[PDB]
């Protein structure tokens, strides 16, 4: 029952300034502490700050103590996280993990989903969707595997799923590629050898820039 | 925000018993843990008891000078937390305090006042107030001293005052001395210079074992 | 500050096999040492905490040991899941120093990938572009030397691959390539390949079309 | 058992100097678990300093704590009125919970002679046959100071119960209290009661007297 | 038991001054079984004056004590370099013999700074791998100073161990002293090993330093 | 006159048993009593035993802290004392001094120097003495400092010389601090002025558990 | 200084009756009290110490008690050898004050004097002097009123009377009187008497003689 | 076994000095401490010093401190009370008592004799002895009574023994008596009835002046 949800997905310009929420549920929001961690692109886990829920006081990890505001909204159990003039390193997944007791010592129990602030003058650009059948080669034998490529969008978080609740299959989500300030992904799924294409499979695609193009594959 | 208010010292036989509660107001933690600490000069400030809750989980912890003597219990629903003390011994003497802190890395614990506990064979003797007041002799500086005597009282706990607290500057209690068994105090008041001394101006004597007082002068 | 230093960064080890992760400490900190466990996409969740204790949810299986200065981490036998990067963090003193990580690369067997070669959508050509792509699916080893031929000769410019780390649920892992040419250059050319060079064949695997009509 | 020790037990520091006490413990532990604590004259103690650099509250900017493991201090930086007092650190990582000595804070201040101030017992006390001389030596410093009675032109010492104070929080001076516990026949056989008192102020001890009007 | 407080158990007096300190017993008692005793830095106790007026011996006329049934107390004509000790009166009259608190002795002087010794870990105990910077901050006065260690310029406080002296004898001064215990690793993967103290004689942070010569 | 002479003192595992001796020169009374004395910042100086030869008696005493566990005993023909303490427990680690005084209403106690008596499961670890020089840092003053380290060693008396007492001038032995169950500590001294430091300047280092030394320098 | 101040200088008490001697203390004096006794002519010996403690060779009958400031003694049957000033002394503080002592007077019953006139010796009276004395011997109560007569009349100068202090085995008083003549003065008179006038008896014991040669 | 001897009486004129000896015998001399007493004519006893034997360390009461050297000579096991600037007070009996621990606390146990000083600058003049017989009265009937009396005399101490250990009858020895610095004495002995006087019953009289005279009594 108890989750931790946070913002979704956010795409500012260097300098600008972004407040990240991560909102407690299942328990009192004021009994446990709370950690602010990031994670570099590619590279590791490193501790921003720590907070006291009951008395709003902060400490910072000193790489992380200027042009950050870590506050919280007690009533409607939700911290937040300030960034102010935002650089080339901003851009990072960054989590809320709950401070717990254990043990006479303390541990982050709950940790919430996660956060991609991208910092970017690219302007958010729309994909398009289209649906790779193999027909005329007559991949026939043992089984299928049909794709799906997403080309050019900006920024990075994209949802890929195959008829939505298909996935138990071999799907393959390959992660996305940076050229020219735009965005390529593709995903394969591999169905009943000789059997489904009798039925519909669909890519189904969902962006945050309200389009949601959902392609089916004809062949 | 949180406030603690205990209440439940005072003298009983040694190998008798004793129970001290402490109430704690506006402290809405689920999780924290509270502790019982001690004072006396015998051995200065010493920690006996522990009790936490953890979500799920009341785990009590003690020590050498009370492993078998002292027990905690909390149930009020929730606010209330209980030392029981028996078998107390003549080292048992100090003033108890309740600590408390909800489980956070870094927090703030809350302190009560305490309560006196005293152990000794020894009844309870009241206090002897006597009023002090110069003549022509104490025409020293330029002010006016005169004061009052608190003659061989039993336990210690005590509150020597003037006119109620009206008159809280240039006030002087002294610490209690100890003389077979008994114990005794003054306090000192350095009323404005001219002669107003004397009338008006009232010496009052709190000693818990039902015995209060308010007395007069020249 | 006090610096967390984990022994080793990569570390293979494969499926019923015991594999003990070591890291130290500058600076004693007793036993508040956890370890936190992260697979990709996902969010980090808490293995050991104190050291020495098993978090709720988790196995049997995941231990640790520690002391003062020097900690370790031990999954008796790997499984194909256990696949991640496996971090330490210190929570004594002010700033929590978290160590780099260890990635688990599990060894495993020989296997060639399922080729798929596709031609560019119909919808694609008409707004202009032509991209073909490969899907070089389920091998292993890691590398593959992926090559296409147009017409003839290989094209090196246009490509750009992309692959997925260790598959958690057979530990294989799987790539994509796509060459993108824009619908001229595209009609000009009728035959294609995907050559996928790899170590499990002495003789690669190929898929290929040539502009037909479906 | 963890054994904390504060150095150093005992100091004397010029009013305004940055004064720095500290807390050596015997196994390492945890920045959080390390509180202390101020406790004025008689009164409760008050947590001063929890983590170990957090300040309580009411608590002023001039004071700060910082250290970690085994080593810990507590710093003021400028030392005033209503910071002489007693300063323990405390220990809540591991059981027993041990407290560490203590630390005693005297504020020097300009010498200042002493108000004495006699006082014969009184007739409600003679009531009993019981009298008891008293007598104050207030808001004096230095701590340094002799009070002898004498019982015409004699000094007596059986029965003399001395008390003295702190340093007060507004102007850090002393103040002692020196009774003469009697009886009405020991007593009213006497006349001239005195109370002298030799301090640094003066090469005169301070008299103050009276000459009984009894029964 | 019977109750001996000693009065006060903390003092620092003018070199010169009639110091005088008290002890109260809580019965009273025969003059002819109250002791006392000085304990100079670590030595045994010295039984100083027995009766309560007979100087032991080697003790100086400076040197006699007071007093009778419940309250006592002992004098130093005038102050001097060898007085600075710590004083317990004792109790030989009724079992059991309870002794009292102590006194601390603080003899004053002239402000001194401090002579800083920096010495880098011994070649014969880096065998080990094991390397603990010394340093000395001798000869000083008054007793309040906070030493810094600085590893390339980076201030460190773990693994520090203080030790200090108490008021010499001939000169009244103090010395501290303050190792850096490491390790050869995090030792030999750094460079610049300072010692720097704040003193009260010279808002310029005395430094010593040395950057290392290893394998 | 009198010389008292005490050995005896060391590490014993708790639980197990010390017996500690004192020998009376030139202490020709045939009535006094003889009194054994503790001390150690737990609890400061606190008296145990005291035995007493009145013409025709021997009564011996003890308090709370020994009652059952410590036993005294005098019997050379006519010279040493014999405190025989077993059974002992965490506590009592202190050192130990015999103290004496004829049977006179004025007299003066004679004292011991007294024997360390540590109890605990650690055993023995030997000091490792390590050599201290500078190099061209401390050329501070116009004097000579040099020192010398002492290492985690267990039971704590011991004795840090130079040039075994030769040079007794500007020496600075420092107390023995306590990292986890073991000991360190140096001594400095500060030899003439100009260059002779280093050589012929010995660090003799004395640890009773058969650890003797002798060190050099740069 | 400690004033040691006891209740009854003088005190009368009958064989085989009890009485108690009071003695105060100043200032507390705790059980640091001892009681010696002083028979005439002979030196004082210890009898209670520590203020309820018998000394050595005491009888059962010496009894003490005593605390802080105030102490007692008490034989509990009185005899006629028990004559005597009894002290008490303090040993606590530095001047050891003494108290004033306390003399027994055992009353008892009246007797009348044996009575002895003599006249003076052959050798004396060669050398110059002639000195009668009389002993009147074994009375009770202790005024008497000795008077002598010579040839008529009594004489009042030349007497010099002599007393000691109640016998101890019987409890009894004694005198001597003796009054000095110069042989000449002597010489002139022929009747002597000695007069015991006293108590006992309304009429007077009466020796006497006259210038005879034996 | 255990006795303390002191010096004989003494006479001085005042403003002379004296040294009164007090032995001891039958124990160990230093390991008891020693006070010295002083009890005026009629007078009452008063405390004077005390002494360590062992260090030679007194402490003298306050009217003591001045003109009175309270020494001693351990090899003989004896005290010494010296006496400077003789004056009409310094007459009294002064005496010398052990001090013994008994239960916690001290008493004199062990007293001396006494001793007596007596400061005048009257002469010292031997007396005379004059036998006392009843004849020419026959005070014959119940028992008979004899008589001594020494005349005229200085210093006060004289010994009046009766047939020397007579005594156990009636013996009255009445205290001398002073008038013109000179001194009187008598003695009285009751002896059987009618049976002894058939037997001679003499008067030994001696007195620190040499002389020694032992006058029977015929008749």
């Known amino acids: 029952q108890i989750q931790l949800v946070q913002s979704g997905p956010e795409l500012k310009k260097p300098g600008e300034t972004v407040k990240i929420s991560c909102?407690?549920?299942?328990?009192?929001?004021?009994?446990?502490?709370?950690?602010?961690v990031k994670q570099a692109p590619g590279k590791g886990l490193k501790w921003?700050?720590?907070?006291?829920?009951?008395?709003?006081?902060?400490?910072?990890?000193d790489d992380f103590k200027g042009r950050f505001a870590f506050s919280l909204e007690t009533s409607a159990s939700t911290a937040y996280l300030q960034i102010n003039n935002l650089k080339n390193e901003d851009t990072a997944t960054?989590?809320?993990?709950?401070?717990?007791?254990?043990?006479?010592?303390?541990?982050?129990?709950?940790?919430?989903?996660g956060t991609s602030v991208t910092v970017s003058s690219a302007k958010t650009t729309a994909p398009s969707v289209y649906p790779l059948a193999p027909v005329c080669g007559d991949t026939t034998g043992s089984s299928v595997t049909l794709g799906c490529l997403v080309k050019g969008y900006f920024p990075e978080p994209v949802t890929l799923t195959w008829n939505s609740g298909s996935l138990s299959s071999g799907v393959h989500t390959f992660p996305a590629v940076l050229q020219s300030d735009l965005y390529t992904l593709s995903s394969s799924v591999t169905v009943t050898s000789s059997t489904t294409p009798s039925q519909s499979i669909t890519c189904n695609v969902a962006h945050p820039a309200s389009s949601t193009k959902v392609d089916k594959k004809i062949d | 925000e949180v406030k603690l208010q205990e209440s439940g010292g005072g003298l009983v036989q040694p190998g008798g018993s004793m129970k001290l509660s402490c109430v704690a107001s506006g402290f809405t933690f689920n999780n924290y843990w509270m502790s019982w600490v001690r004072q006396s000069p015998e051995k200065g400030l010493e920690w006996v008891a522990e009790i936490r809750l953890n979500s799920d989980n009341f785990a009590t912890h003690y020590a050498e000078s009370v492993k078998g003597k002292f027990i905690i219990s909390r149930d009020d629903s929730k606010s209330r937390l209980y030392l029981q003390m028996n078998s107390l011994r003549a080292e048992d003497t100090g003033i108890y305090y309740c600590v408390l802190r909800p489980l956070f890395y870094y927090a703030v614990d809350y302190w009560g006042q305490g309560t006196s506990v005293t152990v000794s064979s020894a009844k309870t003797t009241p206090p002897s107030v006597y009023p002090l007041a110069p003549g022509s002799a104490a025409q020293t500086n330029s002010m006016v001293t005169l004061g009052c005597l608190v003659k061989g009282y039993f336990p210690e706990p005590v509150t020597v005052t003037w006119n109620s607290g009206s008159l809280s500057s240039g006030v002087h209690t002294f610490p209690a001395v100890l003389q077979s068994d008994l114990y005794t105090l003054s306090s000192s008041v350095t009323v404005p210079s001219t002669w107003r001394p004397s009338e008006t101006v009232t010496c009052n004597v709190a000693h818990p074992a039902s015995s209060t007082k308010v007395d007069k002068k020249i | 500050d006090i610096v967390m230093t984990q022994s080793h960064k990569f570390m293979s080890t494969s499926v019923g096999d015991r594999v003990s992760i070591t890291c130290?400490?500058?600076?004693?900190?007793?036993?508040?040492?956890?370890?936190y466990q992260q697979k990709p996409g996902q969010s980090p969740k808490l293995?050991?905490?104190?050291?020495?204790?098993?978090?709720t949810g988790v196995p049997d299986r995941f231990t640790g040991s520690g002391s003062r200065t020097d900690f370790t981490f031990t999954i008796n036998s790997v499984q194909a899941e256990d696949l991640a990067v496996?971090?330490?963090?210190?929570?004594?003193?002010?700033?929590?120093?978290?160590?780099?990580g260890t990635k688990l690369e599990i060894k495993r067997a020989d296997a060639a990938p399922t080729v798929s070669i596709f031609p560019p959508s119909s919808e694609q050509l008409t707004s202009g572009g032509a991209s073909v792509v490969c899907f070089l699916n389920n091998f292993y080893p890691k590398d593959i030397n992926v090559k296409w031929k147009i017409d003839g000769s290989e094209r090196q410019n246009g490509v750009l691959n992309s692959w997925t780390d260790q598959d958690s649920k057979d530990s294989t892992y799987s790539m994509s390539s796509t060459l993108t040419l824009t619908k001229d250059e595209y009609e000009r050319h009728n035959s294609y390949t995907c050559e996928a060079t790899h170590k499990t064949s002495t003789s690669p695997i190929v898929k290929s079309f040539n502009r037909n009509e479906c | 058992?963890?054994?904390?020790?504060?150095?150093?037990?005992?100091?004397?520091?010029?009013?305004?100097?940055?004064?720095?006490?500290?807390?050596?413990?015997?196994?390492?532990?945890?920045?959080?678990?390390?509180?202390?604590?101020?406790?004025?004259?008689?009164?409760?103690?008050?947590?001063?300093?929890?983590?170990?650099?957090?300040?309580?509250?009411?608590?002023?900017?001039?004071?700060?704590?910082?250290?970690?493991?085994?080593?810990?201090?507590?710093?003021?930086?400028?030392?005033?009125?209503?910071?002489?007092?007693?300063?323990?650190?405390?220990?809540?990582?591991?059981?027993?919970?041990?407290?560490?000595?203590?630390?005693?804070?005297?504020?020097?201040?300009?010498?200042?002679?002493?108000?004495?101030?006699?006082?014969?017992?009184?007739?409600?006390?003679?009531?009993?046959?019981?009298?008891?001389?008293?007598?104050?030596?207030?808001?004096?410093?230095?701590?340094?100071?002799?009070?002898?009675?004498?019982?015409?032109?004699?000094?007596?010492?059986?029965?003399?119960?001395?008390?003295?104070?702190?340093?007060?929080?507004?102007?850090?001076?002393?103040?002692?209290?020196?009774?003469?516990?009697?009886?009405?026949?020991?007593?009213?056989?006497?006349?001239?009661?005195?109370?002298?008192?030799?301090?640094?102020?003066?090469?005169?001890?301070?008299?103050?007297?009276?000459?009984?009007?009894?029964? | 038991?019977?109750?001996?407080?000693?009065?006060?158990?903390?003092?620092?007096?003018?070199?010169?001054?009639?110091?005088?300190?008290?002890?109260?017993?809580?019965?009273?008692?025969?003059?002819?079984?109250?002791?006392?005793?000085?304990?100079?830095?670590?030595?045994?106790?010295?039984?100083?004056?027995?009766?309560?007026?007979?100087?032991?011996?080697?003790?100086?006329?400076?040197?006699?004590?007071?007093?009778?049934?419940?309250?006592?107390?002992?004098?130093?004509?005038?102050?001097?370099?060898?007085?600075?000790?710590?004083?317990?009166?004792?109790?030989?009259?009724?079992?059991?013999?309870?002794?009292?608190?102590?006194?601390?002795?603080?003899?004053?002087?002239?402000?001194?700074?401090?002579?800083?010794?920096?010495?880098?870990?011994?070649?014969?105990?880096?065998?080990?791998?094991?390397?603990?910077?010394?340093?000395?901050?001798?000869?000083?006065?008054?007793?309040?100073?906070?030493?810094?260690?600085?590893?390339?310029?980076?201030?460190?406080?773990?693994?520090?161990?203080?030790?200090?002296?108490?008021?010499?004898?001939?000169?009244?001064?103090?010395?501290?002293?303050?190792?850096?215990?490491?390790?050869?690793?995090?030792?030999?993967?750094?460079?610049?090993?300072?010692?720097?103290?704040?003193?009260?004689?010279?808002?310029?942070?005395?430094?010593?330093?040395?950057?290392?010569?290893?394998? | 006159e009198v010389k008292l002479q005490e050995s005896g003192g060391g590490l014993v595992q708790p639980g197990g048993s010390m017996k500690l001796s004192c020998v009376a020169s030139g202490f020709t009374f045939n009535n006094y009593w003889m009194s054994w004395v503790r001390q150690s910042p737990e609890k400061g100086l606190e008296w145990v035993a005291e035995i007493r030869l009145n013409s025709d008696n021997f009564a011996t005493h003890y308090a709370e802290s020994v009652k059952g566990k410590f036993i005294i005993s005098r019997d050379d023909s006519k010279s040493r004392l014999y405190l025989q303490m077993n059974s002992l427990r965490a506590e009592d680690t202190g050192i130990y001094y015999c103290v004496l005084r004829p049977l006179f209403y004025y007299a003066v106690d004679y004292w011991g120097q007294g024997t360390s008596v540590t109890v605990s499961s650690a055993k023995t670890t030997p000091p490792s003495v390590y050599p201290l020089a500078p190099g061209s840092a401390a050329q501070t003053n116009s004097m000579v400092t040099l020192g010398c380290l002492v290492k985690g060693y267990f039971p704590e008396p011991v004795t840090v010389t130079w040039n075994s007492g030769s040079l007794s001038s500007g020496v600075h032995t420092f107390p023995a601090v306590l990292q986890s169950d073991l000991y360190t500590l140096s001594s400095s001294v500060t030899v003439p002025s100009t260059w002779r430091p280093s050589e012929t300047v010995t660090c003799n280092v004395a640890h009773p558990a058969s650890s003797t030394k002798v060190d050099k320098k740069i | 200084d400690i004033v040691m101040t006891q209740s009854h200088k003088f005190m009368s008490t009958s064989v085989g009756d009890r009485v108690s001697i009071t003695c105060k203390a100043s200032?507390?004096?705790?059980?640091?009290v001892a009681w010696y006794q002083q028979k005439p002519g002979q030196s004082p010996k210890l009898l209670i110490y520590?203020?309820?403690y018998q000394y050595t060779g005491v009888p059962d009958r010496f009894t003490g008690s005593g605390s802080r400031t105030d102490f007692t003694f008490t034989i509990n049957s009185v005899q006629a050898e028990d004559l005597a000033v009894y002290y008490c002394?303090?040993?606590?503080?530095?001047?050891?004050?003494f108290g004033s002592g306390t003399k027994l007077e055992i009353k008892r019953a009246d007797a009348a004097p044996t009575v002895s006139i003599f006249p003076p010796s052959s050798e004396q009276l060669t050398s110059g002097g002639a000195s009668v004395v009389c002993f009147l011997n074994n009375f009770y109560p202790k005024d008497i009123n000795v008077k002598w007569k010579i040839d008529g009349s009594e004489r009042q100068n030349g007497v010099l009377n002599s007393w000691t202090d109640q016998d101890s085995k019987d409890s009894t008083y004694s005198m001597s009187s003796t009054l000095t003549l110069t042989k000449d003065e002597y010489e002139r008179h022929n009747s002597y008497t000695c007069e015991a006038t006293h108590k006992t008896s309304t009429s007077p014991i009466v020796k006497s003689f006259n210038r005879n040669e034996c | 076994q255990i006795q303390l001897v002191q010096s004989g009486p003494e006479l001085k004129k005042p403003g002379e000095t004296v040294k009164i000896s007090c032995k001891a015998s039958?124990?160990?001399?230093?390991?008891?401490?020693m006070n010295w007493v002083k009890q005026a004519p009629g007078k009452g006893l008063k405390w004077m010093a005390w002494?360590?034997?062992?260090?030679?360390?007194?402490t003298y009461a306050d009217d003591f401190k001045g003109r009175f050297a309270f020494s001693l000579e351990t090899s003989a096991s004896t005290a010494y009370l010296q006496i400077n600037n003789l004056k009409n007070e310094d007459t009294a009996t002064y005496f010398c008592?052990?001090?013994?621990?008994?239960?916690?606390?001290?008493?004199?146990?062990?007293w001396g004799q006494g001793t007596s000083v007596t400061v005048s600058s009257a002469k010292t003049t031997a007396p005379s002895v004059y036998p006392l017989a009843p004849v020419c009265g026959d005070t014959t009937g119940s028992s008979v009574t004899l008589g001594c009396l020494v005349k005229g005399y200085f210093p006060e101490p004289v010994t009046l023994t009766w047939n020397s250990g007579s005594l156990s009858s009636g013996v009255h020895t009445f205290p001398a008596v002073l008038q013109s610095d000179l001194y009187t004495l008598s003695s009285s002995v009751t002896v059987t009835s009618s049976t002894t006087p058939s037997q001679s019953i003499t008067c030994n009289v001696a007195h620190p002046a040499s002389s020694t005279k032992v006058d029977k009594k015929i008749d």
């Open positions: 008592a052990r001090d013994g621990y008994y239960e916690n606390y001290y008493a004199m146990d062990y």
């Open positions: 039958g124990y160990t001399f230093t390991n008891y401490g």
């Open positions: 002494i360590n034997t062992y260090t030679g360390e007194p």
């Open positions: 200032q507390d004096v705790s059980t640091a």
């Open positions: 520590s203020a309820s």
């Open positions: 002394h303090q040993h606590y503080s530095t001047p050891f004050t």
